[PDB]
Amino acid sequence: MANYTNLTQGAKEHEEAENITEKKPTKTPQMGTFMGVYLPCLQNIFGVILFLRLTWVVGTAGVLQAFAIVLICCCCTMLTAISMSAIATNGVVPAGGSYFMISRALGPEFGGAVGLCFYLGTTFAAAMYILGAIEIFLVYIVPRAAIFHSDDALKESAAMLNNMRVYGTAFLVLMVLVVFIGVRYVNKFASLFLACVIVSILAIYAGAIKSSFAPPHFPVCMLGNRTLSSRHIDVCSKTKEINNMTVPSKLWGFFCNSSQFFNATCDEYFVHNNVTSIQGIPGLASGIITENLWSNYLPKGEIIEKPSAKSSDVLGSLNHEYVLVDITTSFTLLVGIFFPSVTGIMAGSNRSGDLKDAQKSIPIGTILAILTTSFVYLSNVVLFGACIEGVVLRDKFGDAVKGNLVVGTLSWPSPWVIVIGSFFSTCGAGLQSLTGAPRLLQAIAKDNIIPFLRVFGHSKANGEPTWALLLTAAIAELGILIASLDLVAPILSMFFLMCYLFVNLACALQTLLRTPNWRPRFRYYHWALSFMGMSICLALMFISSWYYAIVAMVIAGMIYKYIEYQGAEKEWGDGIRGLSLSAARFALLRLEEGPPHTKNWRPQLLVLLKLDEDLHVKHPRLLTFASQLKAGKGLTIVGSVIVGNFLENYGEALAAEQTIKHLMEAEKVKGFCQLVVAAKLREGISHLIQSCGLGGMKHNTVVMGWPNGWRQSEDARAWKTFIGTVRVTTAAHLALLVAKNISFFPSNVEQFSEGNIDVWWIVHDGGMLMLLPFLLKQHKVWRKCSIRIFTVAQLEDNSIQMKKDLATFLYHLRIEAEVEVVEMHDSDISAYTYERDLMMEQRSNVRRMHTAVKLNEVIVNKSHEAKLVLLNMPGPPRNPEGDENYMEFLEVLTEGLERVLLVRGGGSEV
Amino acid sequence: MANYTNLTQGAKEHEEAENITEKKPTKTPQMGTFMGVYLPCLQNIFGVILFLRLTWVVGTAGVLQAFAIVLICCCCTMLTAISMSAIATNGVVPAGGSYFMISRALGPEFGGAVGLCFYLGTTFAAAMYILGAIEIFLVYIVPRAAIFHSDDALKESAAMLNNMRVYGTAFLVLMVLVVFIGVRYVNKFASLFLACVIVSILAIYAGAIKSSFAPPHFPVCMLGNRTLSSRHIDVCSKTKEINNMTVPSKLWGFFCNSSQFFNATCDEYFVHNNVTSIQGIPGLASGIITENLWSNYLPKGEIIEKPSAKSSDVLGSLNHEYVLVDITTSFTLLVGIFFPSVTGIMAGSNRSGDLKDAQKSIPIGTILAILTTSFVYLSNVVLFGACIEGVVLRDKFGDAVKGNLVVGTLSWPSPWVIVIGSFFSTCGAGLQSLTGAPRLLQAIAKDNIIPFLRVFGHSKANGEPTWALLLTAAIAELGILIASLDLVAPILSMFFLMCYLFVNLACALQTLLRTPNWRPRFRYYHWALSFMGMSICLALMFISSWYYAIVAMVIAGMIYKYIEYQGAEKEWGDGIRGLSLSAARFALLRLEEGPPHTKNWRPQLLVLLKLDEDLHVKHPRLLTFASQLKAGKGLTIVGSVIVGNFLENYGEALAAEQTIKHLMEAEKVKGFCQLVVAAKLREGISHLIQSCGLGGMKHNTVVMGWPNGWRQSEDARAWKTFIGTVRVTTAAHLALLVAKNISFFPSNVEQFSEGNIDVWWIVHDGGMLMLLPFLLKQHKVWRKCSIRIFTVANSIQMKKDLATFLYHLRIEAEVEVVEMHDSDISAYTYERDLMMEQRSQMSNVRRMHTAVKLNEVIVNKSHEAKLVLLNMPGPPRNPEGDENYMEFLEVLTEGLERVLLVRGGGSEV
Ligand SMILES: *[C@@H]1O[C@H](CO)[C@@H](O[C@@H]2O[C@H](CO)[C@@H](O[C@@H]3O[C@H](CO)[C@@H](O)[C@H](O)[C@@H]3O)[C@H](O)[C@H]2NC(C)=O)[C@H](O)[C@H]1NC(C)=O
Ligand SMILES: *[C@@H]1O[C@H](CO)[C@@H](O[C@@H]2O[C@H](CO)[C@@H](O[C@@H]3O[C@H](CO)[C@@H](O)[C@H](O)[C@@H]3O)[C@H](O)[C@H]2NC(C)=O)[C@H](O)[C@H]1NC(C)=O
Ligand SMILES: *[C@@H]1O[C@H](CO)[C@@H](O)[C@H](O)[C@H]1NC(C)=O
Ligand SMILES: *[C@H]1O[C@H](CO)[C@@H](O)[C@H](O)[C@H]1NC(C)=O
């Protein structure tokens, strides 16, 4: 015993859930995976197409191509089921319909795009289902009751379309009234609709089985290889004997105008060929599948010909009774006509609020439902191929079989069971989609995702959409005006295909780009699956119509970008400003949930500009050299401290910030400026070094200017601060670039004709040292200079192996660089070796000076005339007392060189 | 006297310019706008189509639809010229070709995508032009020298393709050798090629004019309304009299097998109808335009029928001599066949290094060249409509006119001048595109934009592409293997259409989004024009082929994203990490060059978390309330100061940072964390308030916790620091949110059944105060509460504005104005007066005794509220009355459950 439904859950349920945040009523609607996602999805996938058009598709395509069609459609819907299950498992499943899940999983932009595309899909589905119910009623149930009787022969089709337009509009107004007043009854009879569907399918299978030994007696009159209609004929014989008199049969009256055979003038094909009674349903074992295993694709108005019977060759006798191909078929048309029979998988999660284990019921339920329907379709394709005559299949309105439903002829009790079950199922699906479309529309309106749809957010006392339904009815009316399933199906299929394409593309993107909160806890979801689904039914979209598909893509893209713009204006306050703001925030967030390190190290600079008492940059050269080092790309944060109290220096801070920005723009520096008004310059710099940049966009190198004239100034703060900053940089594990004699650094406009960047590679931190000159040489200023590595390791035997390691590394760099190893006494490099030993264990002053002068001797003797001498640095002393000695060591170590870039790694650089 | 060229300038010139950075040689190549951009673009737009296929297109389309085709193509190329001129004016024009301009203007990603699409365009153009030169030579000049003689009927049709494939491959190997050895000669003879083109067009016009009084004698044999070929027939008469004997003419031998008229068995149409000589070029005044003003679109193999002359009705006599439609035409096919006649506008700026005023010569020159060629095409459409028979036009191989070029029949001297000028022009354009494709390829390789193309960066001693040219030759070979202009034209057109679509879309985007360094100094460029061009010829792309267009779009998109990825990995060091890094940096940069303010104010929070001596968050409720306030969207920077020395507390700073990040994620706060290890807590907070966030992603509100138990603690620093922070926030012009009794603030899981957020709106700063409760109510926790505004006081004007804002907000709120004595609100009115005074230029016992009145009213009205917002008075000017200020605040909030003290201190709207 159970009282379930197959409809959706709109804003009413999501709202109840949110309020219920802070139960016995909830527990009772809890439904297992089977009755929660299997039956809703099964009742909503099994549409009208399976009946009114599957036999026709099989016939006009040949079992092979029909199998290919059903397989491609089922493949796009199965990969979309996998992507939708990945969405369902990821995070908490909201209580609303599939729209709320898709929204909370893919962001409001994709949520709204999918919502509107799926909504247009559902409206045109309510239109197709009303057209189908009308077509079944009118062609098969009550043919006599058509308001416009067919006029002559040429206007017979036109008279039918008007019957369908008027009857469909009346029926649509009826269905709208039903859904508006008494949707509870629709919920109650969803089970009866599913019952009708399943009874119909079991009747189809029972007929197919019975058709092996005893097939039914539905014969078709056929003149040679020309199939005849049986809507008016009684006997498939040229002369029907009446009262022992061989009077001509009615077909004679339809091919010869005499009607009395008194010297009757019969046309050519009638006199030459012969009328035969061909069994319309041969046995399943008869082996007709070999006959109908091939496409027909006859264009419009072509006579349907069974390529088995004999025939004469005369032509010209065009007649009304010849059953004709009613539409110029093709593969790309058949795929579109059949696709709305696999749609409805988003209905699997239309009952997600009343579930027990959502992430477990929704994926399994949906995939099992799609497997069931795919098996039913792929089995019925072959059964129709192997049970129905190759002529009764191409009959798209049950003609030539005495006016019975083509699939109806395959049934155990009678074709009547199917002709009524299809009608009830199709009107039920129309009601279902006229309840599912306006609920989704009011949910998209209530979310305030799109502003102008706010009007449709209005609900009834119970939370039913009063003003969304009217728009749904209007769109269904526009659809019904094209009173033909064969022409509504491509549009419906295109809208549902766009919905499925976005559901597959959002999952592929969010898996590749490592989108935050994208944890697809599924045992079989791989982004390649969703990508293959997106590709497959993108191809499907374009195949069916290349112009409708572009219109759908552009509509969805405009809705997506407009939702993004509205979200920007909502959260940041401005449209385009806020749009870039959201882009930056999202990039930084995505940047946070990732490995902290990088496979390669690239210097992101923090230029520490020193501001004089006039609040002017004391060293613009710093900015010029930073621009040359980064070459206008990358991150450059220009930081500076203004000594004083912030409470009264805000105006000065703003003025100096404008000054530094103008200077950066003048020196082609692309980056950002940050001023800190601090009580102590040293503490301000210690705060800039560790706090600049938003998380994930941190710097990793600190670029400083050398404290020129440290000895001259009586105050010891200037030299002591530089050391403090060096210690802060080393402790923070950031790289350090101390530029000395920066006033002589070349400007952005001038250039070097010829020169040598003499990188000095000393025991360690070789990665930063080697990487620097190439970044410099990549700029036009340092472009025309060479590079010389004066390695100072051991003597020569060690160097040969190292020479190979450096030469190959440089080979990977692919920039010319000659390395020379100069033997140096360990004592001369004692301070370095000491620091290295301290590092290895972790993982005097007179000697330092007397060795620094040896370093001076070698460095000047080799590199006196260099344009820029890079040089590795030793760490600062542990005791802050020897800071003067450390600065003297550095000053002597750099005595006599034109332009030095002291470099200290102090990090895991490679 | 001048020696100019129409070829491109690749990496060799761009490199010379860059080196020449730090002249007499440069000055000499300087060329004026006319000879620098008008003639190169004119010489490169006038291709082979104008001759070999324009007459055929006019005929098979009808003058009206042919006019529509030429107009649509010219419209896409003109809008693309406007966008490309906008690119040319914006910024300095690089010395290289058009590729370098497009690159430096649209970024390397679009630069490389457009470069490769335009490169495939140029290669398939070298293929089409070689095919055209071969077709002209073989069909019109020397038919005798064809290696595969046509045989039978079906074999004869495919006999030609083998002649064309072999001759085209031979010609392509010849052209490749020429360009490889002696491109200087091509530069020298570019002028002769342009001369041939212009002489040919003037010959067309002279023929059209002469066709007014005296049209030429090109007759066509026509059997009834069935056109015959005249390659073998001599007289358009059934019987050709020989030696005074009426012997049957050869056409009799081609329709009757007797050949002696001895009881000859002639077929049906031949016996019934008549052969007639129809003047093939009637006068311009003859008025045939009225006849050929309509489309034909006859499918493949259909006999071409003039619907004017008499005819019998018998059918069945299918014959070889009946001129047949050689391809199943359609409108969408004609647009594709014709589009490669308007391509070449990027060649206008292929000589930009040798210019005087680039930003002035390139736009005018390009637009004038396109106007000239568009007028020439639209004029020749009408001239062909009004001068050539409606049957001679649909002849795509000069049949029925004795085997002469269709357009050749319209010329003053003879069709030979055009048939040779077209051949030389088409081989010259082939040479041009076999020099322009590899130069562009080596420029894309040398830019190191795409890695794997590095092999093709290799150049010759003079800087000629040795290995790029070979790939161009291979692709041209693959093109020539499809030995038919009618099938190469759609591919060429698709590649050039993709190039133009990207050039229009990048400009539209960079104009809309306010991309940095996008200054389009043009007098007529509006982004709507580039957008209309993008749309027009996107439609053109898809019309011509919906599957080729998708393949091109996917190829270009993959190249674009791959270039972006390679640039990320190059500059940042990682692929996806660096990709997000570049996205963030670019967004922030774009965010910088814009108005600092915003039309709406939205609170971007900086939560100041206080870290205790255990390095644990002393107030997680701060984060919970920040999450509720921002609702998971927006910017939230959580800042905290660790008192101590940074040299030894780095590990502690990292540990506490991980702690704060875990807490943020636990409280559903989406944002970033920044720790500052400072010697003094007050200075650390004063530095966080002014330095957090990258430029453009700044905060505008500071969210603080109230210093609970300030009086109890003997140390006065705790209460004094809060005031210091308030002053820092006010001075920085940021909003301020002081939360009091924050330990009682509701958690993210619980909710309120019913309650009232009692926003108290006092004289000023009404914008922040009104905006807050609605952002709070937008969260599920505060969803089920009501709002009550207890207004106490241009305050009257402000109240009306607030009411209007409430109406705009559309969320139910009831406002009550309570009369209060000015003395009670004295501290507020005093501050307001100070504000008005400063704006115009551009005690304690009373404050406490009035604060208690404020307490009386506020508690009597709002004692049971769930959250009482309340405006704040400014801190005293003298830092001595700071205790008095804190006492004022403490009493002002005495008795309320949960208070959010709010201070605007900014231009909040
Ligand atoms: C159903 O019967 C009609 C009536 O004869 C068939 O029409 C004709 O069928 C032939 C196939 O034999 C078609 O092709 C012809 O083939 C012969 C083979 O030598 C060839 O000599 C002819 O020139 C022609 O190509 C023919 O086009 C078709 N129509 C006419 C007017 O003759 C029809 O094909 C039969 N159904 C099927 C499925 O074959
Ligand atoms: C060139 O001359 C031939 C020889 O008659 C034309 O063939 C026939 O042309 C007629 C049009 O005059 C076509 O349509 C017919 O129209 C009459 C009008 O009443 C109608 O009674 C017929 O049933 C038919 O629809 C006809 O299809 C066509 N072919 C045959 C076999 O008659 C040919 O059309 C002429 N060329 C042009 C461009 O018109
Ligand atoms: C063919 O020529 C004869 C005599 O010149 C003429 O009478 C007849 O009408 C012509 N046929 C047609 C179709 O004009
Ligand atoms: C059709 O079948 C009949 C048997 O009544 C036969 O006489 C007639 O010849 C058949 N058609 C043929 C062979 O033309």
Numbering used by the authors:
A (entry chain B): 102 to 123, 126 to 946, 1028 to 1094
B (entry chain A): 102 to 123, 126 to 896, 901 to 949, 1028 to 1094
Provide the authors' own sentences about this structure as they appear in the paper.
Potassium‐coupled chloride transporters (KCCs) play crucial roles in regulating cell volume and intracellular chloride concentration. They are characteristically inhibited under isotonic conditions via phospho‐regulatory sites located within the cytoplasmic termini. Decreased inhibitory phosphorylation in response to hypotonic cell swelling stimulates transport activity, and dysfunction of this regulatory process has been associated with various human diseases. Here, we present cryo‐EM structures of human KCC3b and KCC1, revealing structural determinants for phospho‐regulation in both N‐ and C‐termini.
To understand the structural basis of phospho‐regulation in potassium‐coupled chloride transporters, we used single‐particle cryo‐electron microscopy to study the full‐length wild‐type KCC3b transporter and mutants of this transporter in which two canonical threonines (T940 and T997) and a third KCC3‐specific phosphorylation site (S45), which was shown to play a role for full activation in response to swelling (Melo et␣al, 2013), were replaced. A unique feature observed in the phospho‐mimetic KCC3b‐PM structure is the presence of pronounced density for a short stretch of the otherwise unstructured N‐terminus, a domain that has not been resolved in any of the previously published CCC structures. Electrostatic surface representations of KCC3b in absence or presence of the N‐terminus illustrate that this segment is wedged between CTD and TMD and partially inserted into the inward‐open vestibule created by the helical arrangement of TM2, TM7 and the helices TM1a and TM6b of the transporter core domain. The direct contact with the ion coordinating helices TM1a and TM6b results in a visible obstruction of the ion access path from the intracellular side, suggesting that this domain arrangement could play a role in controlling transport activity. The change in α7 positioning involves a 21° outward movement of the N‐terminal end of α7, accompanied by a conformational change in the β6/α7 loop.
